[PDB]
Design a protein around this ligand. Structure first.
Ligand SMILES: *[C@@H]1O[C@H](CO[C@@H]2O[C@@H](C)[C@@H](O)[C@@H](O)[C@@H]2O)[C@@H](O[C@@H]2O[C@H](CO)[C@@H](O[C@@H]3O[C@H](CO[C@H]4O[C@H](CO)[C@@H](O)[C@H](O)[C@@H]4O)[C@@H](O)[C@H](O[C@H]4O[C@H](CO)[C@@H](O)[C@H](O)[C@@H]4O)[C@@H]3O)[C@H](O)[C@H]2NC(C)=O)[C@H](O)[C@H]1NC(C)=O
Ligand code: HEC
Ligand SMILES: Nc1cc([C@H](CCN[C@H]2CC[C@H](c3ccccc3)CC2)c2ccccc2)c2nn[nH]c2n1
Ligand SMILES: *[C@@H]1O[C@H](CO)[C@@H](O)[C@H](O)[C@H]1NC(C)=O
Ligand SMILES: *[C@@H]1O[C@H](CO)[C@@H](O)[C@H](O)[C@H]1NC(C)=O
Ligand SMILES: [Ca+2]
Ligand SMILES: [Cl-]
Ligand SMILES: [Cl-]
Lengths: 103, 464
């Protein structure tokens, strides 16, 4: 970890000098709350048929999307104070912050 | 294999199909899903967590890369000019295009067989997901080459590595300025902006700059802003016919649309002069992403909002009330209580019918359901998670553009004059751009100004 430096490293490593991997790439996310899994440590809620979460059945994400999210496209309300650039900058910015790899 | 099987065996976590589905009539079918890579594979001790493959810092890593071999490959190593590599087969009216990738299984080739145009190569792998994102990556690639050319004339003695590093530092500062000065105030609104992002003092090495697991899901609020079409406009901001509005299901991975259908200029015009979709409690997200996500390249069209909910469960995220508690916000226990929080009982009822308790509402779902804050596009919960995250990225960033020693007093004074419309003038054939704030301006020609009126970034303070 260099004592003096002018530029960022490509990986982000050495930005924080006391803990030099904070913000660096290919590292686990920080957690602000303990994780909640069906078995306490790995299985997601919805994994096991009939296993309730907090006394209630786990709703299917597709069912939630169908009943709450779905709406007729012809009804779309344009935002009078935001451009599509507002949407696009957010996606570009999100691609500077996080990417969660898959198998 | 999660792509073709419906069996729930690791790492597959397929989304089951409910009875009376509006699209998928076969209930033995599913929406494919792979669980995110665990930080500690196969552990019986560690509570499963997921990996961030990028640098959490707002450092233009989507342009430069977050790994050294990739970062090297993205550079023009043929000379000592400190530029980034560009496409060798094609140009956009003499202007640069991103290079092509060398994927074994290329999804962009499936969008138009005839065209044979593969995916683009950028700092981040999702550069070709939608041509509007490709346009922004291409714009930032041109800005780096433009900066390194300007800096080479000012400092001829500077070598390739110095030019690359100096131009990279400026690009990253511009991403930070546009984000914290122009973007975030319009996402959070003014009261949340003052609460979670007070006036920057200086770098503090006890501020954890990592992205929180919840932020990867909470920041997906942007899915509620997505329009069902890609809008392309000609020189006079009139619809670029034929096909001035192409459905999103026909633009996913369609890199050929950038190479053969007119370049990045009509896409950027469309983004500036078209209003965003407004998130409303009864109009949350469009069916181009809810029913036909990546429809052209997959065996079945995905459901983006549902993928977000399955993703939060995969990630073991606590539900709505636990995050409302974390933020110091009241936690509703019933449909009566939740109706008050959402200022909308009909939505509270629908949510309670699915979840049973506000404790179980998936963080994206509960977050995008809350009423928007005044002059903001998120409610109190998302404003907290987003706000909290962006303060950690600013106060925990040793290379934050305002931190003493990063730039000189004069270079900061120069960087304050940048804007996204100006970056478009400098790198495209577009001569009429959005009047600042670019994120609020959306109507031609009421909210538009000439490129000559906007001032350029003065590099005078960069000379040695
Ligand atoms: C540099 O940043 C440091 C981090 O600051 C946080 O992040 C930034 C981005 C901002 O959002 C900021 O608001 C955040 O605080 C910052 O250090 C932090 O300073 C605070 C205040 O001194 C510390 O809080 C104190 O914590 C102790 C220990 O308990 C904490 O941890 C446990 C376990 O997680 C929790 O269960 C607790 O709830 C606490 O969070 C508390 O004992 C203490 O509270 C008691 O004392 C105060 C009066 O002294 C009373 O008001 C309370 O009622 C209690 O009686 C505080 O809550 C914080 O732990 C510390 N964090 C770190 C990482 O060190 C630092 O001050 C900034 N430096 C400069 C120069 O600005
Ligand atoms: C401003 C916010 C925002 C916008 C706009 C946005 N997304 Fe998302 N999207 C995210 C974030 C953040 C994630 C999580 C990224 C990660 O770590 O993998 C995400 C994840 C995704 C995923 C992975 C879904 C999963 O859980 O498997 C897909 C697919 C996706 N977005 C596609 C898109 C597409 C297509 C668009 C529009 C062209 C888009 N997003 C626009 C923020 C946004
Ligand atoms: N985490 C993500 C994932 C994606 C997608 C996943 C789909 N991969 C298919 C794409 C088509 C393939 C044939 C099979 C896999 C992607 C987009 C390009 C790069 C990698 C991943 C995103 N798109 N926007 N934001 C995103 N965040
Ligand atoms: C490198 O730079 C030269 C001069 O600008 C250019 O002609 C060449 O195409 C570049 N090569 C790549 C791979 O970008
Ligand atoms: C594919 O690209 C060609 C141009 O090479 C265009 O003429 C054709 O209409 C496109 N086909 C589709 C299905 O979009
Ligand atoms: Ca980054
Ligand atoms: Cl978290
Ligand atoms: Cl190429």
């Amino acid at each position: 970890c260099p004592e003096q430096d002018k530029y960022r490293t490509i990986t982000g490593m050495c930005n924080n000098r006391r803990s030099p991997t904070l913000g660096a790439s290919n590292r686990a996310f920080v957690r602000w709350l303990p994780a909640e899994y069906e078995d306490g440590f790995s299985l997601p809620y919805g994994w096991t048929p009939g296993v309730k979460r907090n006394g209630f059945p786990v709703a299917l994400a597709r069912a939630v999307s169908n009943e709450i999210v779905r709406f007729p496209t012809d009804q779309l309300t344009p935002d009078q104070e935001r451009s599509l650039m507002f949407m696009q900058w957010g996606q570009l910015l999100d691609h500077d912050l996080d990417f969660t790899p898959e198998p | 294999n999660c792509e073709t099987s419906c069996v729930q065996q690791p790492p597959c976590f397929p989304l089951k199909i409910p009875p009376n589905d509006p699209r998928i009539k076969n209930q033995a079918d599913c929406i494919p899903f792979f669980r995110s890579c665990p930080a500690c594979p196969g552990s019986n001790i560690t509570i499963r967590n997921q990996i961030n493959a990028l640098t959490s810092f707002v450092d233009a890593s989507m342009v430069y890369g977050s790994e050294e071999p990739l970062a090297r490959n993205l550079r023009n190593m043929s000379n000592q000019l400190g530029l980034l590599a560009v496409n060798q087969r094609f140009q956009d009216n003499g202007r640069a295009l991103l290079p092509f990738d060398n994927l074994h299984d290329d999804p962009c080739l499936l969008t138009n067989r005839s065209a044979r145009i593969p995916c683009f190569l950028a700092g981040d792998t999702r550069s070709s997901e939608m041509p509007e994102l490709t346009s922004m990556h291409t714009l930032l690639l041109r800005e780096h080459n433009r900066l390194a050319t300007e800096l080479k004339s000012l400092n001829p003695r500077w070598d390739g590595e110095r030019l690359y590093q100096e131009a990279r530092k400026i690009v990253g500062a511009m991403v930070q300025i546009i984000t914290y000065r122009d973007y975030l105030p319009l996402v959070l609104g003014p009261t949340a902006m003052r609460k979670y992002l007070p006036t920057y003092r200086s770098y503090n090495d006890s501020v954890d700059p990592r992205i929180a697991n919840v932020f990867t899901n909470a920041f997906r609020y942007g899915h509620t802003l997505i329009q069902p079409f890609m809008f392309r406009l000609d020189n006079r901001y009139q619809p670029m016919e034929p096909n001035p509005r192409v459905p999103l299901s026909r633009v996913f991975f369609a890199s050929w649309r950038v190479v053969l259908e007119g370049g990045i200029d009509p896409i950027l015009r469309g983004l500036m002069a078209t209003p965003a979709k407004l998130n409303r409690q009864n109009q949350i997200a469009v069916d181009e992403i809810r029913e036909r996500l990546f429809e052209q390249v997959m065996r079945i069209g995905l459901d983006l909002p549902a993928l977000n909910m399955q993703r939060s469960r995969d990630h073991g995220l606590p539900g709505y009330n636990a995050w409302r508690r974390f933020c110091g916000l009241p936690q509703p226990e019933t449909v009566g209580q939740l109706g008050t929080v959402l200022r909308n009982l009909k939505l509270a009822r629908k949510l309670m019918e699915q979840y049973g308790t506000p404790n179980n509402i998936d963080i994206w779902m509960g977050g995008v359901s809350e009423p928007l804050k005044r002059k903001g596009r998120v409610g109190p919960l998302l404003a907290c998670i987003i706000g909290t995250q962006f303060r950690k990225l600013r106060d925990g960033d040793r290379f934050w553009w305002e931190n003493e020693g990063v730039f000189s007093m004069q270079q900061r004074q120069a960087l304050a004059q940048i804007s996204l419309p100006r970056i478009i003038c400098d790198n495209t054939g577009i001569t009429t751009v959005s009047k600042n704030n670019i994120f609020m301006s959306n109507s031609y020609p009421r909210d538009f100004v000439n490129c000559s009126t906007l001032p350029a970034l003065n590099l005078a303070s960069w000379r040695e």
